[PDB]
Structures are given as structure tokens and as C-alpha cells.
Design a protein around this ligand. Structure first.
Ligand code: NAG
Ligand code: NAG
Ligand code: NAG
Ligand code: NAG
Ligand code: NAG
Ligand code: NAG
Ligand code: NAG
Ligand code: NAG
Ligand code: NAG
Ligand code: NAG
Ligand code: NAG
Lengths: 321, 169, 164, 319, 172, 326
């Protein structure tokens, strides 16, 4: 009539786990390893806030589209936030050669310094005031702020020839364009000559573009096009421009001023005052768990995205009252 | 009266730890955890959980990539890759959890079984094995003696004598 | 359980053979067998609930100027196949190890489920069988199978038969 | 006596474990799909587009040898030979060809719309053709293209547009003829130093013919370099040319969307159904793995490089 | 020693059993010595050898030549390739680590149960003829020389033989 | 008082393993499955030694940069060893269209035979001796050995027109270039005409290049550039060159003479006399283990690279010895 008994713990845990052999098994304790929640807010990463473009696009920003004048100067950035289909890109319709390669270049850079490399005041044999209604700054024709539209000075377009030794001590993005007019009349009105070229030389770059004068649908009420291109001028390297017409020349370059780890994420959320080591388009993730299922397109130090609704490790006993 | 052992089920009344003992004597009744058995488990299980969580992880990685309308094969390639990895991780994770939960529960069942045999072996004829995971003593055992059976210092040679006389009717 | 299996038990997976004045026959433990069938069914479904949702359309085509791209793609398709093929093989291998042990332990449990409920009333032969020290007919046989065995009943004469 | 034991049977079936090999068990579930029906089948009810000896370029340009594909219904996926015989009858190339081919691994039906009827090039000869595209002995040309050439000692500027009013997105193809020498360039177009420009809202090309001597392919030295574009709905495409234009008569409205792919095989379609098709045949299975063929199309088990995956479900069969 | 024989499976391992993996120690009038169970040890060695080969029968067929090269205009492509090579390494590295971890857990348990079986293989074949000491050893209630020792090791032990005097010695 | 005991083996093993539940557990035996060592030496693969470029680059080698004259003839190769930033590439500054696609072509080929397809003696209406100080062979202006720089013969550059039927019976790499002068003066000095072209035709290839005459920074003391291109001439196919100026024409093609399995590995190690089925930039791997952690960029039949410091399988017992002298 004296007794000892050996048993195990049970509690009012309701929590279920699955095993290979069994399903919906109630256990005393369990550790969820699948991160499911985010804060809902678009946040700063490693203290830095991301470069938040609003309606502008990288091309709008770097060309200096007037509608992007708020981005004429912007500090260091964690990552880049862009809309899925930004409104203000190429105000003057055209294209951007190797655009996505350029965009990818900004998923490692985290700060530019915009250096004035070819001041427009020094094109003294050409008219630099060219612009249009597609790039209108409140009713008045303008143009991309960082570019210069060379055109004939009173019935002449002499050879346009300027260079720039990159003495900035860091690597520098330079962009330029060629204007593709709508017809021969326009090509003469603006550049006098026909059959023109724009060559650009660096130690490694060697381009030569001829304007393709063709009739085409009006985009932004314009038939002309401007095809932009870009290059990384290495430190102490020189870039030469030579043109007999159709050059859209840069006034500025962009010294890649800070390096590191960014990315571009497409979202319409606005930045807020918070912090993370892992950001997603839906919000940020504070977690120590190895998996999340919030959103595949993360930026930062993140758990492994999985397509799962629940991962729960039993840590406790089989809860059996 | 009393009696649920490992067989029969769990004890809510043992808020103390994970595995343990219930006793019944002239002084009274109460629950008590085996600190040793419980600890070895907590450690084991903590390790199990950390093992699964010491992983890869070192990003930044920035998964979003962008492509032309003339780079659809490239986009698609990239998508199949991102998908392929997610499929692998997702499957391994699910199955990993599943197998390690199977193992964990068995682990608990065997720890409790050990605690049973750790006692059974150290009592033998001095006690009747009831079959519900409890032992009815053939002699008497107070709290002094109860400590001894719990922490493995039980004196079999002591109560050896009268255990026999009570057993033989 | 020791010594081997019984073809004569077409009934289920684990079970009992008995021998008394009435006769001999095999009988499955419906409870023990079921818990296993369920377990094993689940094991098989766990491995089969997977990914799967295509269409995916794996064939891709490339220029003679896109050999690096073609090759990239090939290393990916190969890489995944290598992963899935290895995981599958090893998954199967580990889960078979587990399954067979699972059976051995279910049968061992069935043994101890009986041993514990009989004790001195029966001699443990050591081949996985119990010789009774008393007598037990089909009424009593049901009781030992489905766990309602009366130890306090046959307690008496078990002792007298044991002591010589 | 009572005895506790387990089931055995006359199963011969073997499994492997981490610890043990070729272990006979009472029951086992194969999880590796190994068989296919041997037949090339329809996917989700639809039959695939089955090109025979033609290639996508042969088909869309309207190579004469592909006249059986001038009209074809909706398709599940595209079946093409590994090295189709009838592509570019007139030798040349196709810019961004594989991107175009990939475009047809999501589209599942065209409607071919006549966008620039040839009757309306009234200042040019449209009857140009050659022996490489011969329809039974007689020089012909790609059915869907028009070879503009001079009308009696003159090639006036050729200038036509087309607003895509078809209400769906439309593939337009065109070409530029690269003659073999200056004599041929004048014979056909009068002028030398010519251009073909094409403008849409987003497309802006301007090609000049590269007149060079080159090896005879299909007995011809000239070449025709084709290009293509998706004209968006309500967008306009402008052609302007002073010579060398191979202009489209038809566009291809992308008439049905969805999920296809291209699979390279010489098998002919048959009357069967699947959710998973491979070059060797189709797969009816609930198993998670197959080892039939890596290049599937459809909802398929994971291909593995394995000869056997068998789960033990039964006891260790020891009779 | 020097302290009284007796370490069983419980209590620890035996350096003195250079013979195999699991086995017996005996003590009678003739003497004392260690002896492996060839049967139990073998089944294990085989099991463990297989375990190790299973993990090593793998993929492996290369040549593969992993290095690939890219323009300064193909950074997305380079990056794509990098994420792939990294992705696979991440998978293999994780699976390997965890595979090893799970299979080591299993291996040690495997050994603990093989030894426990060897215990019960004996216990069951001796019963009342011997006292279960509780350190993984059996004290005989009768006597057993090397002739008899072989019998208990290789499973041919005669219980019906020593049945008689085992009882008389037990009853005090 | 007679006794039998059941126990397990222990030894003086110090070796530790980890399990899911337990860490640093000493066991009697263990099998490391993670290959950690290499021999430190750059070795031959399947008997063959690799093509070892030294300071040259593939472009230097195939164009026949003078500083690469030691590679004018080289035997079959296992794989290609190249420096990370080789010194002798394009002596005359320029670029190489689809260069990496070409480099990738040599990670399956394992031998060339260099065939003289367009002997320079037969450009009898042009000067073929053109060269420059950037490609100087001991003080004297030279040029890429395998290329020919066509220039005007005494105030005239007649149309330059040559073909070549690939009768070599194997597939053949042909390379050529177009010279992009620095200014109109240089363009006339050399080719007399302005507005020039270089066309190249095969059955499948059809290029036509015009020289881009632009001012640009001096690389190797030169402002001009030469943009090279390449093609695989299929067996029995013909290649045509036609040019009115600016052609850098090939004298040689490269018949892909052996096929198989190579790769390019970037390293500054020199070849040595050893053998392997798996080579890495740090050294070679002799192993039967499934994983290694030496270096991801292997060439050959190799174990799976992992980012791990230790993988050890327990094979033995939990080593828990006897308190001696027991
Ligand atoms: C159930 O458990 C929780 C502790 O986890 C406790 O807070 C709650 O009050 C409990 N309720 C009862 C009735 O025991
Ligand atoms: C497990 O529980 C969920 C409810 O959360 C249910 O939807 C599902 O069908 C259950 N499965 C089983 C086997 O009971
Ligand atoms: C550019 O400037 C630096 C001195 O600031 C000089 O060393 C270098 O030669 C110049 N580079 C070129 C390409 O002219
Ligand atoms: C065993 O240790 C001491 C004996 O002095 C006792 O106080 C304690 O309660 C016991 N612990 C357990 C878990 O039984
Ligand atoms: C195409 O058609 C419609 C007329 O139905 C017109 O409104 C639209 O502006 C046209 N677009 C162009 C680019 O011509
Ligand atoms: C697959 O086979 C089973 C019969 O074995 C049949 O019921 C099922 O409908 C089949 N499916 C197809 C698509 O043939
Ligand atoms: C003890 O270990 C050493 C190496 O650490 C070895 O050489 C020696 O043989 C071992 N001792 C015995 C008795 O096996
Ligand atoms: C195990 O051992 C290693 C060194 O041998 C040590 O650095 C590590 O911290 C140890 N790990 C644990 C969990 O004790
Ligand atoms: C090249 O020569 C082969 C025989 O060597 C011949 O069959 C063929 O006609 C020639 N090819 C061309 C394009 O002239
Ligand atoms: C590789 O290892 C084996 C070990 O059995 C050895 O005998 C052989 O010589 C080794 N090869 C080299 C090149 O070191
Ligand atoms: C094999 O088992 C079958 C059940 O399908 C049974 O009919 C038969 O008796 C067995 N074979 C023999 C020879 O008994």
C-alpha cells in the first residue's frame, strides 16, 4: 500500500505538430521555425535609408528629367525603391542602351556624387539651349537637367569635340545620347548637315552612332527619339566626344561615391522610420528563424523563403491528459 | 486512487519538469521531476533546434532581377532557378521537420521508459510491478527512502528482509 | 516474434497464436496493426505531398553565340536533378531503416503489453511465447488479447503449479 | 500457450535501407514512375501545334513547303523536328529568333490578319521570287511576305503604315534583302545605298543592305535578314524604304494565351490525353518522381537519375 | 582489478575487449577474460559500412569545369550564375551537415540497442538460473565452466540442465 | 559466485563527433567525409598537361601577339591555365567581339592545329608589312603574327578580295579585324580612301563593318583600335573577305583538332609533374570523399564543394572507457 509511479508532463497546450507517421498530434511545447509576419512598413536597412524614387525611374533620375528635380542631389542609400511602372523616365521619348545592366550596377553602389565634367558654357560654337514640350517644366520647354542638347549656332554646326580626364579619384558613370530626328527637314533645322555621327572614345570604349532619321508614331507628342548610352570611365582615363551633329552630351558624370550592398525593389510603399536587416516589398522581417514565407523578393540578411504554411518542431512531450 | 504512470498518460500535476515520479506513502502524495532526466532532454532538444537553425543565411542577397522584353528566356531561366531552389528548400524543410518530430516524440517515450527501468532494476523483489508504470512496495518507504529511489541511491539490501515476508502472502 | 514470421496469420500485421484444449489458431491485434497501417500510410503520403505544380516546360533553346547561357542552363537543370536524385535515394534509405525498426518495436510492445499484464501467472519461454502456469480457454484468451485479462482471478492456482 | 508474432507472405520484393541491402519485405510502394505510354498526346484537351518538317520561321514567313500551316487551330505546345527541313527557303537569318520561339511557349493561338495587302503597293512590282522558294518548278516566295522591286526603271520611296486595330497584340515580321552584288541591287531596286526603316512607338530600326559576295546556300548568294516586333494594340508601325524591303502582308494577332512549350521530337501526335508529356511518351502517374526523360512539358513528377525508389510499407518478410 | 570485475553495458566500455564491438566478460573457477560476439559485431560493422557507403554513393560524374567568364556588360548574367553556384553550395552544405548530424544520432542509438539486445538475448535464455545484478551482468545461481560459457555466448545454453541446483542455491 | 557480463568496446580514441542531440561526443571510430587537403601543386589531368599561357591571354595567343611567340605551336591540353590579368593580350589596343563565347569554346576543345589559310604572299596589290611599336619585337615595329595588316601599295588600295574553302576536314576558327584609325589623316596615309568597309561572308555569317574614325586616349601609346571578330567555318564551307580598306585579315585559322573536356582556370601557379582527376587553383585533390572545402572553382571529377569546416560520421561506439586499473 505504498507506491511509486513514473510519468511525464502534460499541460493545457493545444498546439499540434505533424510527424512522418502521425498528423495533428498535440504536444506540450513546440517551436515554430517559419517566420510568417512582417511589420507592414518600408524601412531603413543598416541605419541608412533607401533611395526612394517615387514616380521617377533610374533613367529619369540620372538623365535629370525635370519632373525628378527633387533627386538632383540625394544622400547615400541602403537599397533603391522604384515603382513597378514609374511615370517619369524618358520625358523625351527614346531608349537607353544596356539599361538593365546599368540598373544592376546600382545594386552594389550606395552613393553617387554628381560631378560637373563638361560644363555647357564651354560649347561656345553651338547652341546649348535646345529643349522641348515633352520635358516641360511648368509649361516651358526644358530638357534633361544633366544633359545638353547641341544644335547649330546660326547656320553652322562645327565639329563638337570635348574630352574629360577622370581626375575624380573614383570610378565614374558617364551617359550620353544621340538624337534620332523625325525627318530630314528637322535634321537640318537643328544640325545643318545630314549624315552625321557621334563618336565616343575611352581607353576601352569605342562607339560611333549615326542618327537613324525615320518617321514614327508620336510618343509624348514627339516623333524624334533619343537613344542614350553609358559607360564607366575608370580613374585617370579620358573620354572623348566627337560629333558633327545629333549629340546629346552630358554636363555631369556620377562618381560612384560609396560601395556596398543594395538592390532595387519594386513597390509603391513609402519609407518610414524603422530598421531591419531584411526588407521585403510587403514589410520588414524581424526574425531569428531560418525560414519565412512572406515574400520571395527580399533584400538584406533574410531567412530562406519557402512555399509552406507551417513548420513546427515538437520540442515537448506528447500532450495526453 | 492515483496510479497513472508513463502508461495511461500525462500528469498536469507535474508542473515541475518533463519526466518524473509520483509517490504515495503514510506522509502523503506529491509529484516530483527527475532533474537529471529532464535536463539531458532539454539539452538534447535545444540542440536539435539549434542544429536546424545553424544553416546558411549570410546575405545581403537582393533576389529581384530585371530583364528586357528581348531577354525573356533569360528572365525565365532565372525564374526556374529561383523556383528550383524554393522547391528544394521547401521540401527539405517540410520533411526535415516531419522526421525530426517523429524522432523527438520517440525520444521522450524512451526517456520515460528508461526512468522506469532505472527504478525497476534498482528495486526488484522489494516491489511489485503493477503494469501501469507503477511499483507497489512489498515493504514500507517514507520520504527518506523516497529520495533514495529518485536519485538512484536506493538501499535494496536494507529493506531486503521484510519485503520477502510480506511477499509470501 | 523471435524466430520469425507467420504465413498462417493472413489476418493482419502483428498478432497472437494460442494453444489450449479447444484448439490452436492465429489472430491479429486489430489495434496494433491499425496504428501501424495508419502510420505507414502517412509515411507514404508525407513523401508524396511534395511540390509538383507545373506547367514548367523544361526545354529551352539557344544560339551558337549563347553557349555559355545554354551551359549555365544545363548546369542548373543538372544541379537540381543531382539534388533531387540524392535526396530521394537517401530519403527512401532512411525511411526504410526507420520503418523496419518501427515494426520490430510494435511487435516488442505487443510482447510487453502481455508480459506486464500476466507476470507470475505465466512462464516467459524466451522465444516470444508465454507458457501459462494455470489454464486459459477462449473466454480468457479474448481477455489477454484485448487487454482485459484477469490476473487476480487465476492468481491462486498459478502459484501452486509454479512451485514444482 | 500464447505467442506474439508477425505477418509473412510469399512476397519476393526487396528494399534497401541505410543499414541493409536487398531486404525482402512483405509489402512495398514504388514511388518512382518508370513507364510512359509511347505516344505523343494532347495536353489539357488541346492538341499541340505539330510542324512536321517546318520550322517556326518557315511557318511564320510562309515558306511554300509549309502551306499546310497557312491556317492552324489553337495549340497545347509546339512539336518541332530537331533539324527541320523547311525554314528559310531563301537563305538568311532571323534576328532574335529564339526570343520569338520562346514567345510561342506562352501563346497558344494565332489569327493571321492581312495588315498590308500587296495590291496597294501600286508603284512597285510585288511579284518578286526565286528558285529557292520554288512551288513545283516555279519561282515563288514566302507566302506572307512581299518582295518589293522596281516598276519599270523606278523604285519610288515605299511608304506604308498600319494602326493595330485588331484589339490584340500583333507580331509583325519583315526583312531586308542583302543582295550578292551591285548589278543585282540595280536590277531589282535601281538605286544603290538604300535603306529600310521601321518605326513604332517603341521600335526604331534602320537597316542598310550589306551587298557582299558569299557562298551559295540553296543555290543563292543573296540573304534576307528578318526581324520582328510586337505591335501593341492601337499602336502604328511605319515602313519606309528606298529599296531592299521584304515587307509583310500579314501580321499574327496573338489570339489565345496560356501555357505551352516547344519539344523537339519526330513522333506524330495521337489521340490520347495527359497533364505531363515527354519526347518518349506521356506520363499518367501520382508518384513524385519519374526517370523517363528530363525534357517534360506539363505538370510532372520530379525527374531523377535513379533506377529504383521503393519504400518499405510492410514487415521484414522472414518465413 | 583491483575493484571486482563487473562493468557491463551499464557503467561503460571495456578497453580490454580489443576483439570486436559488443561482447562478453566472464568469471569462473578457470579464470576471467573478454570475448566479442562475432555475430552481433558483424551485423553492426555491415550496417555501419553500408551507412557510410550510402552517403558516399552520390552523384559525382564530372568533368564539370565550374569557372565561367563574363563581360562588364553581363553583370546580371555573371550574378545569375553566381547565385546558382552559391545556391547549390548552400543546399549541399546544409544537407550534408544535417545528414551527418542525424545519422550520428542514429548510429550511437544503434549501438546502444545492439548491446541491449545482446543483454536480453542472454537474460531470456537464462532466467531463474541466474541473478540479474543490474550493472549489465548476471550472477549464476549455479556453476558454469568454459564448456557452458560457450553455450551462453553462441546461444546454445542448456537451461533444462542446470535447472535443478539453481533452485536449491536460490532459496536462501 | 560465477558471472557473465555484457559490454562494449572502448579505446584511446580522442575523436569527437556531433549528433542532432549532442555535441563533441567522443567515439571509438569516425570517418571524415570532408576532404580538406590539397597537394599545393598545379598538375596534369588524365595524363595530359594543361595549356599554360603564362602572361599571355587567349586573344594574345590566337592573334599571335609577338610576346606570345612561345605559343605559336602547342600540343594537346587538359585544361587552360591563364593569369587573372594577363599582360600580353591585344598589343595593339582594341577589343574582341564575343570574346568570352570564344573562351568558352576552348573549355571543350583540347587541341588546335594552326592551318595557313590565307598566305600573305598572295595579297600582291597591297602592302602587308604594316605594324607598330605597340607590338614591337625587340625595338622594331611588328604586328600580330597570325594577322596581316593590309595597307595601300603606292597611292592605291584596290578592292581586297580573297576566299577560303575549309577543306581541312574539321571545324575551323577564323579570326579577323577592322582597324579603327585615330583621324582622317591616318586613314588616308594607310588606305587612301575614306568611308571604307570590311565585309565577311560564309554560308551563315554575314558581317559588314565600317571603320569608326574617332579621337581617343592613347593605350600602349596608340589612339587607333582594332576590333576583332571570329567565326567557326564549318567543314567544306567557304569564307569570303572583301574590303576597300581597314581589313586586318587572318593568315591562319585554327582547326579544332582534338575534342573533349577542358576548362580555363585563373591562377599564377606553374605546372608541375603530378597527376589528378580533380584540379583546383590551390592544388590538386586526391580523394574518395564526397565533399571538399578547398576551393569552389575546380576542374575534373571532384567531390561536391561545401562551405563547411567539418563533417564526420560516427562509425564506432560512444567511447566511454574503464576506470583503470579496473
Ligand atoms: C492554461 O495554461 C496557461 C499557462 O500556459 C495559464 O496561463 C492558464 O491560466 C491555464 N489555465 C488553467 C485552467 O490551468
Ligand atoms: C489537421 O487539422 C486541420 C485543422 O487545422 C485540418 O484542416 C486537417 O484536415 C487535419 N488533418 C487530419 C489528418 O486530422
Ligand atoms: C589623366 O590625368 C593624370 C594626371 O592627373 C595623368 O597621369 C594621365 O596621364 C591622364 N590620363 C589620360 C588618359 O590622358
Ligand atoms: C536526490 O538528492 C537529494 C538527496 O540528498 C534530495 O534532497 C533530492 O530531493 C533528490 N532529488 C530527486 C530528483 O529526487
Ligand atoms: C489608331 O487609331 C485610333 C482611331 O480609331 C486613333 O484614335 C489613334 O490615335 C490611332 N493611333 C495612331 C498612333 O495612329
Ligand atoms: C490513369 O490510369 C487510370 C487507370 O489505371 C485511370 O483511371 C486514369 O483516368 C488514367 N488517366 C489518364 C489521363 O489516362
Ligand atoms: C593509442 O593511440 C595511439 C595514437 O593516438 C596509437 O598509436 C596506439 O596504438 C593506441 N593504443 C592502443 C593500445 O591501441
Ligand atoms: C566543441 O569543440 C570545439 C573545438 O574542438 C569548440 O571550439 C566548440 O566551441 C565546441 N562546441 C561545443 C558546443 O561545446
Ligand atoms: C568546297 O570544296 C568541296 C570539296 O572539297 C566542294 O564539295 C564544295 O563544292 C566547295 N564549297 C563551295 C561553297 O564552293
Ligand atoms: C592517392 O591516395 C592513395 C591512397 O590509397 C595513394 O596510394 C596514391 O598514391 C595517391 N595518389 C597521389 C598522386 O598522391
Ligand atoms: C504464398 O501465399 C499465398 C497467398 O497468395 C498462399 O495461397 C500460398 O499458400 C503461399 N504458397 C505456398 C506454397 O503455400
Amino acid at each position: 500500500s505504498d507506491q511509486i509511479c513514473i510519468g511525464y508532463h502534460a499541460n493545457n497546450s493545444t498546439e499540434k505538430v505533424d510527424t512522418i507517421l502521425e498528423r495533428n498530434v498535440t504536444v506540450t511545447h513546440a517551436k515554430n521555425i517559419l517566420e510568417k509576419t512582417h511589420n507592414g512598413k518600408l524601412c531603413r536597412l543598416s541605419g541608412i535609408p533607401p533611395l526612394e524614387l517615387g514616380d521617377c525611374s533610374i533613367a529619369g533620375w540620372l538623365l535629370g528629367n525635370p519632373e525628378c528635380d527633387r533627386l538632383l542631389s540625394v544622400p547615400e542609400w541602403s537599397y533603391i525603391v522604384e515603382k513597378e511602372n514609374p511615370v517619369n523616365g524618358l520625358c523625351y521619348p527614346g531608349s537607353f542602351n544596356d539599361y538593365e545592366e546599368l540598373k544592376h550596377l546600382l545594386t552594389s553602389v550606395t552613393h553617387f556624387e554628381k560631378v560637373k565634367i563638361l560644363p555647357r558654357d564651354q560649347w561656345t560654337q553651338h547652341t546649348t539651349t535646345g529643349g522641348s514640350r515633352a520635358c516641360a517644366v511648368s509649361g516651358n520647354p526644358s530638357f534633361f537637367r544633366n544633359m545638353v542638347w547641341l544644335t547649330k549656332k546660326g547656320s553652322n554646326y562645327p565639329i563638337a569635340k570635348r574630352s574629360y580626364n577622370n581626375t575624380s579619384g573614383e570610378q565614374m558613370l558617364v551617359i550620353w545620347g544621340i538624337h534620332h530626328p523625325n525627318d530630314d527637314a528637322e535634321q537640318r533645322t537643328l544640325y545643318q548637315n545630314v549624315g552625321t555621327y557621334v563618336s565616343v572614345g575611352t581607353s576601352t570604349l569605342n562607339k560611333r552612332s549615326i542618327p537613324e532619321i525615320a518617321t514614327r508614331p508620336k510618343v509624348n507628342g514627339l516623333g524624334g527619339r533619343m537613344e542614350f548610352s553609358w559607360t564607366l570611365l575608370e580613374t585617370w582615363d579620358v573620354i572623348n566626344f566627337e560629333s558633327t551633329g545629333n549629340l546629346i552630351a552630358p554636363e555631369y558624370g556620377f562618381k560612384i561615391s560609396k560601395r556596398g550592398s543594395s538592390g532595387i525593389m519594386k513597390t509603391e510603399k513609402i519609407l518610414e522610420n524603422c530598421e531591419t536587416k531584411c526588407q521585403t516589398p510587403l514589410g520588414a522581417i524581424n526574425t531569428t528563424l531560418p525560414f519565412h514565407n512572406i515574400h520571395p523578393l527580399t533584400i538584406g540578411e533574410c531567412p530562406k523563403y519557402v512555399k509552406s504554411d507551417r513548420l513546427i518542431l515538437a520540442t515537448g512531450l506528447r500532450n495526453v491528459p | 486512487g492515483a496510479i497513472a504512470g508513463f502508461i495511461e498518460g500525462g500528469w498536469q500535476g507535474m508542473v515541475d519538469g518533463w519526466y518524473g515520479y509520483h509517490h504515495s506513502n503514510d506522509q502523503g502524495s506529491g509529484y516530483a521531476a527527475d532533474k537529471e532526466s529532464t535536463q539531458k532532454a532539454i539539452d538534447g532538444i535545444t540542440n536539435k533546434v539549434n542544429s536546424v537553425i545553424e544553416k546558411m543565411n549570410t546575405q545581403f542577397e537582393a533576389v529581384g532581377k530585371e530583364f528586357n522584353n528581348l531577354e525573356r528566356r533569360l528572365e525565365n531561366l532565372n525564374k526556374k532557378m529561383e523556383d528550383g531552389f524554393i522547391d528544394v528548400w521547401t521540401y527539405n524543410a517540410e520533411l526535415l521537420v516531419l522526421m525530426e518530430n517523429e524522432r523527438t516524440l520517440d525520444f521522450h517515450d524512451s526517456n520515460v521508459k528508461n526512468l522506469y527501468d532505472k527504478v525497476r532494476m534498482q528495486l526488484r523483489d522489494n516491489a511489485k510491478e503493477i503494469g501501469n508504470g507503477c511499483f507497489e512496495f512489498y515493504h514500507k518507504c517514507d520520504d527518506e527512502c523516497m529520495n533514495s529511489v529518485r536519485n538512484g541511491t536506493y538501499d535494496y539490501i536494507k529493506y531486503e528482509e521484510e519485503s520477502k515476508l510480506n511477499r509470501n502472502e
